[PDB]
Design a protein around this ligand. Structure first.
Ligand SMILES: N[C@@H](CC(=O)O)C(=O)O
Ligand SMILES: N[C@@H](CC(=O)O)C(=O)O
Ligand SMILES: N[C@@H](CC(=O)O)C(=O)O
Ligand SMILES: N[C@@H](CC(=O)O)C(=O)O
Ligand SMILES: N[C@@H](CC(=O)O)C(=O)O
Ligand SMILES: [Ca+2]
Ligand SMILES: [Ca+2]
Ligand SMILES: [Ca+2]
Ligand SMILES: [Ca+2]
Ligand SMILES: [Ca+2]
Ligand SMILES: [Cl-]
Ligand code: NA
Ligand code: NA
Lengths: 135, 160, 156, 135
């Protein structure tokens, strides 16, 4: 699974996600990636999110929308919402993986609970940061 | 806030002890070239929607990542792809799932969003919709890689 | 216990000037019979999961409602059915979409929840999965009604 | 579209939804009905919900989960959350329809913004109520 989130110069947010799914899945299986609110979500009033990991758990937890709802209704920062979803709730439900997220204020988060997550981010006009492992 | 992009190419058991620097640098180089493309698009005033679409298109094209070319295999040694795109401005979204004959699922998802009254299309229905709006009919074999075939086989072996 | 059930058979398909009292009575009769069945099951100590499954299966079976028998037609005069079931106790869920050869999509969705490692299955893969678990294969002909066919023509 | 929600004597919530979709749909189209959080959701901590109406809008608004999150995070009652989603948020996006919902305390709500919604409800051991038009 791959994905991207962005905030543009006009203040708009967007998210995209694409995948082949999970190795050895039954033909006909659909994971979180194409489902709005599970693997992908964007709303100018809150956040843009794209997820990766154990897709069945991300559907059942509505992970991408849950980031938005924790901010919108739970009063959480992006960093707090990301920690709650990825480091606490998802593992407790037996899911692993991560996500990327950008909020309307231009904050960025790339939480994951796995050994690694291929990832990169960068502000327009600045040098990017890339990573694979934790820290 | 300042314009910004983030991308990912997947989470999982990426093992440092099993990786070499040369292997890691292939991933780092791919990620950096794609995120820089996005940063430059942002700076030039492209829309967030076009930026996330292009980043995901490039990640699909890159055989290192499980999307598009480089997709994982099903139990039946076939490929079935999914994608989604969402515009935070209008809250419009488009998505495809279970598609095997479209090269770039993220581009088909954009088509569902912009050129249909719908949000999600699946299977041959999604393919036929996309075909009529300019996407060419590919063979699923184009997605196949040795890397992911080996992973299917190793996963089968653990299952036994 | 404070056990309760609600059901619906669709919003937005309704208009008082285009309907008859006899049609309205038939809907009221169907809803009343199905909700009663659900109540009696709850009273007898059946699970919420079994109750919503059975209520939706009955709504599928009844040709008055756009699910299962009595489904609407696509642009191509075909039927493509979707369903979902979810358990609040475990957050387990199962769903199918784009199925044409399964009589009761909600039963297939329950099969996905309970007898696969997945949450959602679509199309021929969902059908093949179901057939392998003992579910029967039907012709999509069985869903077709004149009510919905005539509505397809009106949408044209 | 059809649906059911229930609270059982053990205190468990469940929901289910089934449909043929929308008349004259493009083959391959999927609406909200089979999508967790859009047309169907259940969580013992909050609510069981089943939706019906203009499916695309219910996906974009994650209508069923939004009821849940408004209650669980925002602290709203079932009636308040139903009003916000069905009478305010869904119409603002071009959406029409309704839903049924039962919360963990056995409150039931059957909001709709359309001319009608075929519906029925009843407590175990009591007489059921049915409806078609507003009331
Ligand atoms: N979340 C993806 C798989 C992944 O990200 O590795 C899916 O379930 O299809
Ligand atoms: N989201 C609410 C409460 C909070 O963030 O703590 C606010 O910003 O006012
Ligand atoms: N929503 C962010 C910022 C804010 O409330 O001002 C937070 O709760 O931390
Ligand atoms: N537009 C590209 C890719 C595609 O159609 O899938 C081509 O025609 O080669
Ligand atoms: N919400 C259903 C249609 C309906 O409930 O009438 C769908 O979009 O498939
Ligand atoms: Ca401007
Ligand atoms: Ca706060
Ligand atoms: Ca806040
Ligand atoms: Ca712009
Ligand atoms: Ca070509
Ligand atoms: Cl009469
Ligand atoms: Na790829
Ligand atoms: Na029916």
């Amino acid at each position: 699974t791959v994905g991207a989130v962005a905030l543009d110069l006009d203040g708009n947010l967007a998210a995209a996600t694409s995948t082949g799914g999970m190795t050895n899945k039954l033909p006909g299986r659909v994971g979180d990636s194409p489902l709005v609110g599970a693997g992908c979500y964007a709303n100018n009033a809150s956040v843009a999110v794209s997820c990766t990991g154990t897709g069945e758990v991300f559907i059942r937890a509505l992970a991408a929308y849950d980031i938005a709802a924790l901010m919108d209704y739970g009063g959480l920062s992006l960093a707090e919402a990301c920690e709650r979803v990825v480091m606490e709730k998802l593992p407790a439900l037996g899911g692993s993986g991560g996500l990327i997220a950008i909020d309307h204020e231009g904050n960025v988060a790339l939480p994951f609970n796995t050994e690694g997550m291929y990832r990169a981010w960068g502000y327009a006009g600045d040098t990017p940061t890339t990573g694979i492992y934790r820290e | 806030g300042k314009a910004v992009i983030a991308i990912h190419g997947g989470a999982g058991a990426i093992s440092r002890a099993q990786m070499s620097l040369q292997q890691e640098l292939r991933y780092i180089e791919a990620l950096s070239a794609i995120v820089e493309t996005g940063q430059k698009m942002l700076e030039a005033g492209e829309s967030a929607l076009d930026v996330v679409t292009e980043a995901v298109r490039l990640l699909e094209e890159c055989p290192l990542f499980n999307a598009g070319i480089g997709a994982v295999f099903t139990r039946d040694e076939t490929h079935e792809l999914d994608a989604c795109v969402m515009d935070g401005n209008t809250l419009k979204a488009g998505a495809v799932a279970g598609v095997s004959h479209l090269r770039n699922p993220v581009l088909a998802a954009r088509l569902v969003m912009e050129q249909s009254p719908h949000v999600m299309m699946i299977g041959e229905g999604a393919e036929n919709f996309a075909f009529a709006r300019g996407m060419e009919r590919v063979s699923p074999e184009i997605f196949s890689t040795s890397l992911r075939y080996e992973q299917l086989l190793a996963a089968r072996k653990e299952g036994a």
